[PDB]
Write a protein that binds this DNA or RNA. Structure first.
Length: 351
DNA sequence: CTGCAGGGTTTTTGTTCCAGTCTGTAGCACTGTGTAAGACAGGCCAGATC
Protein backbone atom coordinates (compact mmCIF):
# COMPACT_ATOMS: atom_id res chain seq x y z
CA UNK A 1 0.00 0.00 0.00
CA UNK A 2 2.42 2.65 -1.26
CA UNK A 3 2.06 5.64 -3.58
CA UNK A 4 4.61 6.64 -6.25
CA UNK A 5 4.44 10.16 -7.76
CA UNK A 6 4.51 9.91 -11.55
CA UNK A 7 5.47 12.55 -14.10
CA UNK A 8 3.20 12.96 -17.14
CA UNK A 9 6.24 14.12 -19.14
CA UNK A 10 4.37 14.62 -22.43
CA UNK A 11 0.66 14.67 -23.34
CA UNK A 12 -0.78 15.85 -20.03
CA UNK A 13 -3.66 17.87 -21.55
CA UNK A 14 -5.58 14.81 -22.82
CA UNK A 15 -6.68 13.51 -19.41
CA UNK A 16 -9.77 15.26 -18.03
CA UNK A 17 -11.86 15.09 -14.81
CA UNK A 18 -14.09 12.22 -15.95
CA UNK A 19 -12.54 9.47 -18.07
CA UNK A 20 -12.20 5.70 -18.26
CA UNK A 21 -9.37 3.16 -17.97
CA UNK A 22 -10.09 -0.10 -19.80
CA UNK A 23 -8.04 -3.04 -18.54
CA UNK A 24 -7.93 -5.73 -21.24
CA UNK A 25 -5.05 -8.06 -22.17
CA UNK A 26 -2.44 -6.72 -19.81
CA UNK A 27 -1.78 -3.12 -20.75
CA UNK A 28 -4.46 -0.51 -20.02
CA UNK A 29 -6.18 1.84 -22.49
CA UNK A 30 -7.12 5.41 -21.59
CA UNK A 31 -10.51 6.33 -23.02
CA UNK A 32 -11.94 9.83 -23.08
CA UNK A 33 -10.07 13.03 -23.81
CA UNK A 34 -10.51 16.79 -23.84
CA UNK A 35 -12.10 17.86 -27.10
CA UNK A 36 -12.65 15.85 -30.25
CA UNK A 37 -9.92 13.58 -31.67
CA UNK A 38 -6.84 15.39 -32.98
CA UNK A 39 -4.96 14.06 -36.00
CA UNK A 40 -2.09 12.81 -33.83
CA UNK A 41 -4.52 10.01 -32.90
CA UNK A 42 -7.57 9.78 -35.16
CA UNK A 43 -9.25 7.10 -33.01
CA UNK A 44 -9.45 8.58 -29.52
CA UNK A 45 -8.06 5.68 -27.43
CA UNK A 46 -4.55 5.70 -25.98
CA UNK A 47 -2.36 2.93 -24.62
CA UNK A 48 -0.83 3.57 -21.19
CA UNK A 49 2.59 2.38 -20.00
CA UNK A 50 4.08 3.29 -16.62
CA UNK A 51 7.84 2.79 -16.42
CA UNK A 52 10.48 4.21 -14.05
CA UNK A 53 7.94 6.77 -12.84
CA UNK A 54 7.27 8.03 -16.36
CA UNK A 55 3.66 7.92 -17.58
CA UNK A 56 3.79 7.32 -21.34
CA UNK A 57 0.79 7.50 -23.68
CA UNK A 58 0.91 5.88 -27.13
CA UNK A 59 -1.47 6.16 -30.07
CA UNK A 60 -3.77 3.23 -30.85
CA UNK A 61 -5.26 2.48 -34.27
CA UNK A 62 -8.54 0.73 -35.03
CA UNK A 63 -9.06 -2.10 -37.51
CA UNK A 64 -10.48 -1.78 -41.00
CA UNK A 65 -14.02 -3.02 -40.26
CA UNK A 66 -14.68 -1.05 -37.06
CA UNK A 67 -16.70 2.10 -36.42
CA UNK A 68 -15.38 5.09 -34.50
CA UNK A 69 -16.33 6.59 -31.16
CA UNK A 70 -16.68 10.09 -29.78
CA UNK A 71 -14.76 10.57 -26.55
CA UNK A 72 -17.57 9.85 -24.08
CA UNK A 73 -16.80 11.70 -20.86
CA UNK A 74 -18.61 9.72 -18.11
CA UNK A 75 -19.87 6.49 -19.70
CA UNK A 76 -20.92 3.21 -18.12
CA UNK A 77 -18.24 0.53 -18.61
CA UNK A 78 -18.98 -3.18 -18.17
CA UNK A 79 -16.23 -5.81 -18.46
CA UNK A 80 -17.46 -8.82 -20.46
CA UNK A 81 -14.93 -11.50 -19.57
CA UNK A 82 -13.30 -14.14 -21.75
CA UNK A 83 -15.67 -16.81 -23.09
CA UNK A 84 -17.37 -17.73 -26.35
CA UNK A 85 -16.82 -16.24 -28.62
CA UNK A 86 -14.92 -12.93 -28.71
CA UNK A 87 -12.79 -12.10 -25.68
CA UNK A 88 -12.19 -9.74 -24.29
CA UNK A 89 -15.24 -7.52 -24.56
CA UNK A 90 -15.97 -4.11 -23.11
CA UNK A 91 -19.53 -2.77 -23.20
CA UNK A 92 -19.57 1.05 -23.19
CA UNK A 93 -22.83 2.98 -22.76
CA UNK A 94 -23.58 5.73 -23.09
CA UNK A 95 -21.84 8.86 -21.76
CA UNK A 96 -21.47 12.50 -22.81
CA UNK A 97 -20.17 13.54 -26.23
CA UNK A 98 -17.58 16.35 -25.91
CA UNK A 99 -20.05 18.37 -27.95
CA UNK A 100 -22.31 18.47 -24.94
CA UNK A 101 -24.95 15.83 -25.67
CA UNK A 102 -26.09 12.43 -24.44
CA UNK A 103 -25.37 9.37 -26.60
CA UNK A 104 -27.80 6.44 -26.28
CA UNK A 105 -25.81 3.98 -28.42
CA UNK A 106 -23.99 0.96 -27.00
CA UNK A 107 -20.44 0.15 -28.13
CA UNK A 108 -18.47 -3.10 -27.94
CA UNK A 109 -14.68 -2.85 -27.83
CA UNK A 110 -12.25 -5.76 -28.34
CA UNK A 111 -8.67 -6.66 -29.36
CA UNK A 112 -7.87 -7.93 -32.88
CA UNK A 113 -4.21 -8.65 -33.73
CA UNK A 114 -0.56 -8.06 -32.86
CA UNK A 115 2.04 -6.92 -33.07
CA UNK A 116 4.10 -6.70 -35.09
CA UNK A 117 6.46 -4.62 -32.90
CA UNK A 118 4.59 -4.06 -29.61
CA UNK A 119 1.51 -2.84 -31.49
CA UNK A 120 -2.11 -3.66 -30.62
CA UNK A 121 -5.03 -3.18 -32.99
CA UNK A 122 -8.53 -2.73 -31.55
CA UNK A 123 -12.01 -2.93 -33.00
CA UNK A 124 -15.21 -1.16 -31.96
CA UNK A 125 -18.72 -2.13 -33.06
CA UNK A 126 -21.97 -0.32 -32.45
CA UNK A 127 -24.61 -2.71 -31.12
CA UNK A 128 -28.09 -1.87 -32.32
CA UNK A 129 -30.66 -2.03 -29.51
CA UNK A 130 -34.23 -3.07 -30.37
CA UNK A 131 -36.29 -1.61 -27.55
CA UNK A 132 -37.53 -0.39 -25.13
CA UNK A 133 -34.12 1.29 -25.29
CA UNK A 134 -32.96 2.97 -22.07
CA UNK A 135 -32.97 6.75 -22.32
CA UNK A 136 -29.58 8.36 -22.86
CA UNK A 137 -27.92 8.94 -19.51
CA UNK A 138 -24.53 9.34 -17.87
CA UNK A 139 -23.07 8.08 -14.63
CA UNK A 140 -25.28 5.00 -14.55
CA UNK A 141 -23.87 1.51 -14.12
CA UNK A 142 -23.92 -1.64 -16.25
CA UNK A 143 -22.88 -5.08 -15.03
CA UNK A 144 -22.57 -8.50 -16.68
CA UNK A 145 -24.28 -11.55 -15.18
CA UNK A 146 -23.97 -15.25 -16.08
CA UNK A 147 -26.97 -17.41 -15.14
CA UNK A 148 -27.69 -21.01 -16.15
CA UNK A 149 -25.62 -20.51 -18.13
CA UNK A 150 -26.29 -17.67 -20.53
CA UNK A 151 -25.04 -14.10 -20.39
CA UNK A 152 -27.01 -10.90 -19.89
CA UNK A 153 -26.43 -7.37 -18.62
CA UNK A 154 -28.19 -5.29 -15.96
CA UNK A 155 -28.40 -1.51 -16.46
CA UNK A 156 -29.41 0.75 -13.60
CA UNK A 157 -29.18 4.27 -12.26
CA UNK A 158 -27.83 7.49 -13.65
CA UNK A 159 -28.90 11.04 -14.40
CA UNK A 160 -30.31 12.67 -17.52
CA UNK A 161 -31.30 16.10 -18.76
CA UNK A 162 -34.81 17.43 -18.10
CA UNK A 163 -37.57 15.67 -20.11
CA UNK A 164 -37.74 16.94 -23.71
CA UNK A 165 -40.91 18.99 -23.23
CA UNK A 166 -39.97 20.78 -19.98
CA UNK A 167 -36.39 21.79 -20.81
CA UNK A 168 -36.23 25.59 -21.01
CA UNK A 169 -33.26 27.55 -22.34
CA UNK A 170 -32.84 28.77 -18.76
CA UNK A 171 -32.96 25.23 -17.27
CA UNK A 172 -30.87 23.83 -20.12
CA UNK A 173 -27.91 22.45 -18.36
CA UNK A 174 -30.20 21.29 -15.44
CA UNK A 175 -30.08 17.55 -14.81
CA UNK A 176 -32.44 15.27 -12.85
CA UNK A 177 -32.35 11.62 -11.88
CA UNK A 178 -33.80 9.25 -14.46
CA UNK A 179 -36.71 7.09 -13.30
CA UNK A 180 -35.72 3.95 -11.29
CA UNK A 181 -36.34 0.92 -13.51
CA UNK A 182 -33.82 -1.81 -14.27
CA UNK A 183 -33.07 -2.68 -17.89
CA UNK A 184 -32.01 -6.21 -18.84
CA UNK A 185 -29.93 -6.11 -22.04
CA UNK A 186 -28.96 -9.15 -24.05
CA UNK A 187 -25.52 -8.75 -25.63
CA UNK A 188 -26.97 -10.08 -28.88
CA UNK A 189 -29.49 -9.65 -30.06
CA UNK A 190 -30.59 -6.17 -29.08
CA UNK A 191 -33.68 -7.25 -27.14
CA UNK A 192 -33.73 -5.00 -24.06
CA UNK A 193 -36.46 -5.39 -21.44
CA UNK A 194 -37.57 -2.86 -18.81
CA UNK A 195 -38.63 -3.97 -15.33
CA UNK A 196 -39.89 -2.06 -12.29
CA UNK A 197 -38.32 -2.18 -8.83
CA UNK A 198 -40.92 -2.44 -6.04
CA UNK A 199 -38.28 -1.68 -3.37
CA UNK A 200 -36.36 1.13 -5.12
CA UNK A 201 -38.58 4.22 -5.33
CA UNK A 202 -35.68 6.41 -6.49
CA UNK A 203 -32.66 6.27 -8.76
CA UNK A 204 -29.07 7.22 -8.04
CA UNK A 205 -25.74 7.78 -9.78
CA UNK A 206 -22.01 7.35 -9.24
CA UNK A 207 -22.56 4.09 -7.35
CA UNK A 208 -19.93 1.36 -7.73
CA UNK A 209 -21.64 -1.88 -8.76
CA UNK A 210 -20.04 -5.30 -8.21
CA UNK A 211 -21.50 -8.33 -9.98
CA UNK A 212 -20.58 -11.89 -9.03
CA UNK A 213 -22.21 -15.14 -10.16
CA UNK A 214 -25.65 -13.82 -11.16
CA UNK A 215 -25.85 -11.50 -8.15
CA UNK A 216 -25.48 -7.71 -8.33
CA UNK A 217 -24.47 -5.58 -5.34
CA UNK A 218 -24.90 -1.80 -5.54
CA UNK A 219 -22.90 0.26 -3.07
CA UNK A 220 -24.11 3.70 -2.06
CA UNK A 221 -24.75 6.37 -4.64
CA UNK A 222 -25.52 10.07 -4.47
CA UNK A 223 -29.22 10.93 -4.65
CA UNK A 224 -30.11 14.41 -5.90
CA UNK A 225 -33.75 14.40 -4.75
CA UNK A 226 -33.02 14.50 -1.00
CA UNK A 227 -29.25 15.22 -1.29
CA UNK A 228 -28.57 12.09 0.77
CA UNK A 229 -25.76 9.56 0.33
CA UNK A 230 -27.44 6.40 1.64
CA UNK A 231 -25.29 3.93 3.57
CA UNK A 232 -27.66 1.07 2.66
CA UNK A 233 -26.48 -1.60 0.23
CA UNK A 234 -28.74 -2.96 -2.53
CA UNK A 235 -28.72 -6.58 -3.66
CA UNK A 236 -30.54 -7.85 -6.72
CA UNK A 237 -30.92 -11.35 -8.10
CA UNK A 238 -31.47 -12.07 -11.81
CA UNK A 239 -32.85 -15.50 -12.66
CA UNK A 240 -32.78 -15.80 -16.45
CA UNK A 241 -35.33 -18.34 -17.69
CA UNK A 242 -37.34 -18.77 -20.87
CA UNK A 243 -38.80 -16.49 -21.55
CA UNK A 244 -39.42 -13.84 -18.88
CA UNK A 245 -36.31 -12.36 -17.21
CA UNK A 246 -37.71 -12.28 -13.68
CA UNK A 247 -35.77 -10.02 -11.31
CA UNK A 248 -35.93 -9.86 -7.52
CA UNK A 249 -34.31 -7.52 -5.01
CA UNK A 250 -33.51 -7.00 -1.33
CA UNK A 251 -31.85 -4.47 0.96
CA UNK A 252 -28.75 -4.99 3.08
CA UNK A 253 -28.66 -2.96 6.29
CA UNK A 254 -25.15 -1.52 6.13
CA UNK A 255 -22.61 -0.65 3.44
CA UNK A 256 -20.10 2.11 2.82
CA UNK A 257 -21.53 5.59 2.17
CA UNK A 258 -19.42 6.32 -0.90
CA UNK A 259 -19.83 7.90 -4.35
CA UNK A 260 -17.52 7.74 -7.39
CA UNK A 261 -15.23 5.11 -5.91
CA UNK A 262 -12.27 3.49 -7.66
CA UNK A 263 -13.09 -0.23 -7.46
CA UNK A 264 -9.81 -2.02 -8.15
CA UNK A 265 -9.70 -5.83 -8.39
CA UNK A 266 -6.90 -7.56 -6.49
CA UNK A 267 -7.79 -11.17 -5.81
CA UNK A 268 -10.12 -13.50 -7.65
CA UNK A 269 -13.32 -11.85 -6.39
CA UNK A 270 -11.77 -9.56 -3.74
CA UNK A 271 -11.85 -5.84 -4.56
CA UNK A 272 -10.56 -2.74 -2.85
CA UNK A 273 -12.82 0.31 -2.78
CA UNK A 274 -10.14 2.98 -3.03
CA UNK A 275 -12.17 6.05 -2.04
CA UNK A 276 -14.17 8.97 -3.30
CA UNK A 277 -16.67 11.44 -1.85
CA UNK A 278 -18.62 10.85 1.38
CA UNK A 279 -19.86 14.45 1.72
CA UNK A 280 -20.03 17.42 -0.63
CA UNK A 281 -16.91 18.85 1.06
CA UNK A 282 -14.86 16.05 2.65
CA UNK A 283 -13.35 13.27 0.55
CA UNK A 284 -12.83 9.68 1.67
CA UNK A 285 -9.26 8.96 2.77
CA UNK A 286 -9.71 5.43 4.14
CA UNK A 287 -9.16 2.45 1.84
CA UNK A 288 -11.72 -0.32 2.24
CA UNK A 289 -11.67 -3.97 1.19
CA UNK A 290 -14.73 -5.79 -0.16
CA UNK A 291 -14.72 -9.54 -0.58
CA UNK A 292 -17.67 -10.98 -2.48
CA UNK A 293 -19.15 -14.41 -1.79
CA UNK A 294 -22.66 -15.83 -2.04
CA UNK A 295 -23.09 -15.29 1.71
CA UNK A 296 -22.61 -11.55 1.29
CA UNK A 297 -20.19 -8.65 1.23
CA UNK A 298 -17.33 -8.87 3.72
CA UNK A 299 -16.02 -5.39 4.43
CA UNK A 300 -12.87 -4.41 6.32
CA UNK A 301 -11.07 -1.09 6.44
CA UNK A 302 -7.37 -1.38 5.63
CA UNK A 303 -4.47 0.89 6.54
CA UNK A 304 -4.57 3.75 4.01
CA UNK A 305 -1.19 4.71 2.54
CA UNK A 306 0.28 7.87 4.01
CA UNK A 307 -0.87 10.74 1.81
CA UNK A 308 1.34 13.75 1.19
CA UNK A 309 -0.19 17.03 2.34
CA UNK A 310 -1.06 17.94 -1.26
CA UNK A 311 -3.38 14.98 -1.89
CA UNK A 312 -4.80 15.25 1.65
CA UNK A 313 -5.78 18.93 1.31
CA UNK A 314 -6.96 18.76 -2.30
CA UNK A 315 -10.46 19.98 -3.08
CA UNK A 316 -11.29 17.06 -5.42
CA UNK A 317 -9.67 13.98 -6.88
CA UNK A 318 -10.51 11.23 -9.37
CA UNK A 319 -8.82 8.37 -11.16
CA UNK A 320 -9.18 4.80 -12.30
CA UNK A 321 -7.85 1.29 -11.83
CA UNK A 322 -4.73 0.04 -13.60
CA UNK A 323 -5.46 -3.45 -12.26
CA UNK A 324 -3.55 -6.05 -10.26
CA UNK A 325 -4.18 -4.10 -7.06
CA UNK A 326 -2.78 -0.94 -8.66
CA UNK A 327 -4.66 2.27 -9.34
CA UNK A 328 -4.05 5.74 -10.75
CA UNK A 329 -5.17 8.98 -9.11
CA UNK A 330 -4.94 12.59 -10.25
CA UNK A 331 -4.92 15.92 -8.42
CA UNK A 332 -5.55 19.25 -10.19
CA UNK A 333 -2.77 21.78 -9.65
CA UNK A 334 -2.45 25.55 -9.32
CA UNK A 335 0.24 28.05 -10.23
CA UNK A 336 1.15 31.00 -12.40
CA UNK A 337 1.81 30.84 -15.30
CA UNK A 338 0.15 27.62 -16.47
CA UNK A 339 2.08 24.55 -15.20
CA UNK A 340 0.89 23.68 -18.03
CA UNK A 341 0.37 20.14 -16.74
CA UNK A 342 -2.94 20.67 -14.96
CA UNK A 343 -2.80 17.30 -13.17
CA UNK A 344 -0.24 15.72 -10.87
CA UNK A 345 -0.41 11.92 -10.98
CA UNK A 346 0.05 9.30 -8.27
CA UNK A 347 0.19 5.51 -8.65
CA UNK A 348 -1.05 3.60 -5.61
CA UNK A 349 -0.19 -0.08 -5.21
CA UNK A 350 -1.45 -2.71 -2.79
CA UNK A 351 0.57 -5.33 -0.87
C1' DC B 1 -74.04 97.70 -49.08
C1' DT B 2 -70.37 94.70 -51.70
C1' DG B 3 -66.63 93.22 -54.89
C1' DC B 4 -61.43 93.57 -56.49
C1' DA B 5 -57.49 96.64 -58.22
C1' DG B 6 -54.27 99.16 -57.01
C1' DG B 7 -53.07 103.95 -54.71
C1' DG B 8 -50.51 105.32 -50.63
C1' DT B 9 -48.77 104.00 -45.32
C1' DT B 10 -45.42 101.73 -41.76
C1' DT B 11 -42.52 98.07 -40.51
C1' DT B 12 -40.20 93.78 -41.68
C1' DT B 13 -36.40 91.72 -43.96
C1' DG B 14 -32.63 92.31 -45.66
C1' DT B 15 -30.00 95.13 -48.99
C1' DT B 16 -24.23 96.68 -50.50
C1' DC B 17 -18.52 96.96 -47.74
C1' DC B 18 -14.97 97.70 -45.38
C1' DA B 19 -12.39 97.81 -40.26
C1' DG B 20 -12.65 94.50 -37.46
C1' DT B 21 -14.13 90.08 -33.10
C1' DC B 22 -15.68 85.62 -32.32
C1' DT B 23 -16.91 80.85 -33.23
C1' DG B 24 -16.65 76.26 -35.18
C1' DT B 25 -14.72 72.89 -38.15
C1' DA B 26 -10.66 71.35 -41.23
C1' DG B 27 -5.68 69.82 -41.67
C1' DC B 28 -1.95 67.62 -39.59
C1' DA B 29 0.29 61.98 -38.49
C1' DC B 30 -1.07 58.42 -35.97
C1' DT B 31 -3.86 54.87 -32.26
C1' DG B 32 -5.94 50.38 -31.09
C1' DT B 33 -9.03 46.17 -31.18
C1' DG B 34 -7.02 42.03 -34.04
C1' DT B 35 -2.27 37.24 -29.31
C1' DA B 36 -1.18 29.40 -30.08
C1' DA B 37 -1.14 25.08 -30.73
C1' DG B 38 -1.63 21.74 -34.35
C1' DA B 39 -0.54 19.31 -39.00
C1' DC B 40 2.97 16.99 -41.70
C1' DA B 41 7.23 15.03 -43.68
C1' DG B 42 11.60 13.03 -42.94
C1' DG B 43 15.50 10.80 -40.12
C1' DC B 44 16.53 7.08 -37.01
C1' DC B 45 16.90 3.92 -33.13
C1' DA B 46 15.56 0.45 -30.06
C1' DG B 47 13.53 -3.41 -29.10
C1' DA B 48 11.49 -7.35 -30.96
C1' DT B 49 12.32 -11.57 -33.90
C1' DC B 50 14.48 -15.41 -36.77
Amino acid sequence: MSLQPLTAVNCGSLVQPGFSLLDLEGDVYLFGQKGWPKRSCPTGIFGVRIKKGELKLRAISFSNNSSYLPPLRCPAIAHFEAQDGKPECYLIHGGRTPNNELSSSLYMLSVDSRGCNRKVTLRCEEKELVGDVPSARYGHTLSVINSRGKTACVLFGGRSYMPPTERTTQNWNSVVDCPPQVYLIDLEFGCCTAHTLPELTDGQSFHVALARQDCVYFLGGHILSSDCRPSRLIRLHVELLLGSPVLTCTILHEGLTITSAIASPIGYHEYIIFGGYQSETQKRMECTYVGLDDVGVHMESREPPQWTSEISHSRTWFGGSLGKGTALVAIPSEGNPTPPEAYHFYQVSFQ
